[PDB]
Amino acid sequence: LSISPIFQGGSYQLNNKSIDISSLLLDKLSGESQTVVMKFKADKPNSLQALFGLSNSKAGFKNNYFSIFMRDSGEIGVEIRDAQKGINYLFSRPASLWGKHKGQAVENTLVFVSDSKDKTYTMYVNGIEVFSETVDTFLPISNINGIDKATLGAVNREGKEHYLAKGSIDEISLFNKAISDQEVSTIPLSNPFQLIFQSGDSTQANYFRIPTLYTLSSGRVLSSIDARYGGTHDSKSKINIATSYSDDNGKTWSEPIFAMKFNDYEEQLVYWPRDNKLKNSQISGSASFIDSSIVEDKKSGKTILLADVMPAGIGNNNANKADSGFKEINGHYYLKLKKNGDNDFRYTVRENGVVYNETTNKPTNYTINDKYEVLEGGKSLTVEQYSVDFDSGSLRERHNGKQVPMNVFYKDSLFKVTPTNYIAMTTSQNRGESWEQFKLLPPFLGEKHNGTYLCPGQGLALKSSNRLIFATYTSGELTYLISDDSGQTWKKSSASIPFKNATAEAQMVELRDGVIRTFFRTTTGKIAYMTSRDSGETWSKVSYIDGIQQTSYGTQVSAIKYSQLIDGKEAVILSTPNSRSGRKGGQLVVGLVNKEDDSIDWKYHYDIDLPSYGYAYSAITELPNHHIGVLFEKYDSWSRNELHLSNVVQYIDLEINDLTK
Ligand SMILES: CC(=O)N[C@H]1[C@H]2O[C@@](C(=O)O)(C[C@@H]1O)O[C@@H]2[C@H](O)CO
Numbered sequence: 001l002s003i004s005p006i007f008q009g010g011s012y013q014l015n016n017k018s019i020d021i022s023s024l025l026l027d028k029l030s031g032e033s034q035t036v037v038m039k040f041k042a043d044k045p046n047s048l049q050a051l052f053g054l055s056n057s058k059a060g061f062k063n064n065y066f067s068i069f070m071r072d073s074g075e076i077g078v079e080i081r082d083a084q085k086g087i088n089y090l091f092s093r094p095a096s097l098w099g100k101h102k103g104q105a106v107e108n109t110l111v112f113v114s115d116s117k118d119k120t121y122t123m124y125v126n127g128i129e130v131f132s133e134t135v136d137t138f139l140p141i142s143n144i145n146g147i148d149k150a151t152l153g154a155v156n157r158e159g160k161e162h163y164l165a166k167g168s169i170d171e172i173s174l175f176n177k178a179i180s181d182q183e184v185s186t187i188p189l190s191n192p193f194q195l196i197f198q199s200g201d202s203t204q205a206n207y208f209r210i211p212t213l214y215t216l217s218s219g220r221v222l223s224s225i226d227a228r229y230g231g232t233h234d235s236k237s238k239i240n241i242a243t244s245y246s247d248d249n250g251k252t253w254s255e256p257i258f259a260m261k262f263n264d265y266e267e268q269l270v271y272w273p274r275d276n277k278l279k280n281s282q283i284s285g286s287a288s289f290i291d292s293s294i295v296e297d298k299k300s301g302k303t304i305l306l307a308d309v310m311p312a313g314i315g316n317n318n319a320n321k322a323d324s325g326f327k328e329i330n331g332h333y334y335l336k337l338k339k340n341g342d343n344d345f346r347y348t349v350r351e352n353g354v355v356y357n358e359t360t361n362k363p364t365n366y367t368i369n370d371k372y373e374v375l376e377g378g379k380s381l382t383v384e385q386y387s388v389d390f391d392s393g394s395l396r397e398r399h400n401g402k403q404v405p406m407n408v409f410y411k412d413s414l415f416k417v418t419p420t421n422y423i424a425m426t427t428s429q430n431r432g433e434s435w436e437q438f439k440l441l442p443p444f445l446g447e448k449h450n451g452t453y454l455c456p457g458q459g460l461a462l463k464s465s466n467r468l469i470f471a472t473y474t475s476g477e478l479t480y481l482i483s484d485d486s487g488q489t490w491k492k493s494s495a496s497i498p499f500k501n502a503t504a505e506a507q508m509v510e511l512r513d514g515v516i517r518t519f520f521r522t523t524t525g526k527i528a529y530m531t532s533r534d535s536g537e538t539w540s541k542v543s544y545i546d547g548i549q550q551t552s553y554g555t556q557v558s559a560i561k562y563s564q565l566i567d568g569k570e571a572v573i574l575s576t577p578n579s580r581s582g583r584k585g586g587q588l589v590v591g592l593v594n595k596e597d598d599s600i601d602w603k604y605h606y607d608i609d610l611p612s613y614g615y616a617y618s619a620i621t622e623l624p625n626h627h628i629g630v631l632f633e634k635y636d637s638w639s640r641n642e643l644h645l646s647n648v649v650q651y652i653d654l655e656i657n658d659l660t661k
Contacts, residue, residue, distance in 0.1 A: 586615025
């Protein structure tokens, strides 16, 4: 840092009693710009607590103060208030903090920059920028009328301690300068987590959701994710599937690449609005991919990744449930196309990509190549790309002058697919260094049924055979997709479930050879399971796990078969929020398998962080060194208050002894 602190202090215990630092700090504040650097712990916070306050403590000036505050939800924020100036700034972001990790309080590193030159207030926690707000009328934190108290662990208002804190401030420093983003990056951190995917990386997505992890036979650990461009919204949106891998047991990760991507819309790093009027803004004319899952095939050595594919403007909410998008002729399914100007789907994509007119029974001069792009007499047709912006005060989607290959999933294509959901497949023969062009899977539930929905996370490679299984769901059932030929062909195995309209996200473990247990999200508040004892051909009725709570809408749950005995027994590890309130209270739950009846004793619960801190979708894998890697959404991804947060999908490394303590 280019300058020394005006005040520095440490080892402050905040035990619901403020610490007055007025005489040490107030007369050292000068000029209109300041930086606060604070290292602090709060593993048992109050509902709302102030970590640092500067206030006018006198009668009649209760709303003249600056504070750095946090909530027991993990939210961090500031207030900057002066009643005489008529200013009441409040800037915050949910899900910004860690509480505990491996049972010990985490030291959070907070950096707040108040910059009078740029009229901007910026907050970083744990190296992540969580807000940056420019104002028309700047209020220097010292310029609040009548400030006479500087306080740790409360704000002194009219002589009383408000917003009392429980925690500790291990170090706090203030500077009479707005330090640069570059200087900020030099401040040491004590983070319990890593980032694999992050804002500003090669994906240029500012948001991520739906993590996966899979340990490959080489020892490489692979991860896939939704790179979500238009905020954290599900499709309809612009979303690509990105991947990254680690060759050192998760200590470092490769720069992401794409496994599946569309180019109808630019890859733009956009700061999606979080205000109540605009937060529902959703990219509406882009094709997308959503919800990926990985498996490795022993025979071929291929890595196989599946994901849902959504045509332009389509998502689960508006996909046509009564149309697969294929025509069966006869025994073979051919992708249907509608040509601009036709009200009906007159075409199919036949062998060799030939576009065939169903009404005239003649091939046309158009072909669809292996990238689902349209050619006419062998030449590639193009469309103009779109970009998005909020410069007009609402979301605008507009052509940007760049030509890209015309794809049948695009809004502007001459030939367009049925507006329903599909599933696609890509393979890698180099363990994630590159991905082949995706191919659509066929329909499994007939001509007049939309795609099933891929369960995000892992597929299952049965240990003693060549069988691969990917779970998917639809209304009234799980639909397991089974391949015995390295993913060249798939058949379904349907397993009825006693819920309609469930997002029945399911993950599988092989308890022993040929015996599969599937754990899945329900609408009941409990995680369900079912068992197959014939390698997925047939499935039991549904049972429920006791000792874990979910919300009524549920959350995805990840599950693995651990390779080593725990307490002399075979073990399964589940990862899920454990809360009836929200997507919070993340846990790993270790289940010991009864060798006589395949029942599971859920003997250990490990809290990922505080019960009140967010935890949503998750990925777990046994790393080659027998550690457990967890990549998870550290926020409430259902909440309409926690939309569009950056750098909340995070990675941690745990050992079994951390879980069973
Ligand atoms: C294909 C798709 O939309 N997948 C979604 C669904 O699940 C999630 C969720 O957070 O619950 C996130 C997934 O990415 O939101 C969706 C909702 O539940 C409707 O199924």
